[PDB]
Symmetry: D2
């Protein structure tokens, strides 16, 4: 489904349960932008 070559994946340890949800949130945020980056500007 799109994305031909998969870029190198990485990982990061985040102490704290509530704090973890915060980092993951920013992760999906930027990922959302990159997702619409494949759609023409109009």
């Amino acid at each position: 489904k799109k994305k031909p070559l998969d870029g190198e994946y990485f990982t990061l340890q985040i102490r704290g349960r509530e704090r973890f949800e915060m980092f993951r949130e920013l992760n999906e945020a930027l990922e959302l932008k990159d997702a619409q980056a494949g759609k023409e500007p109009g």
Copy 2:
């Protein structure tokens, strides 16, 4: 060394090498604040 009970640890996958360094940076940032949180206010 301080920190008696260790809080639950977690992890997060971050695609992209350059992007990874960015997330890790914010991680050490907040961790730096919590580190000085154990020092009296003066």
Copy 3:
């Protein structure tokens, strides 16, 4: 255009030109998520 009552707006000073672009990026990131939050799940 949608968004009836405007929520209280705020501001934050960010020293550094390159650093500024970084913060603004995360700003548009979360804003992008909230933008698709008004669209039904399918």
Copy 4:
């Protein structure tokens, strides 16, 4: 007090009161790192 030439300052609008506190938090986080960057490594 240290910091001879002040770097160009900037600003960013953040909608949402609770959300604002979140951004400001990351701001002080990186600023805390830069603060210890002036102290020798030991």
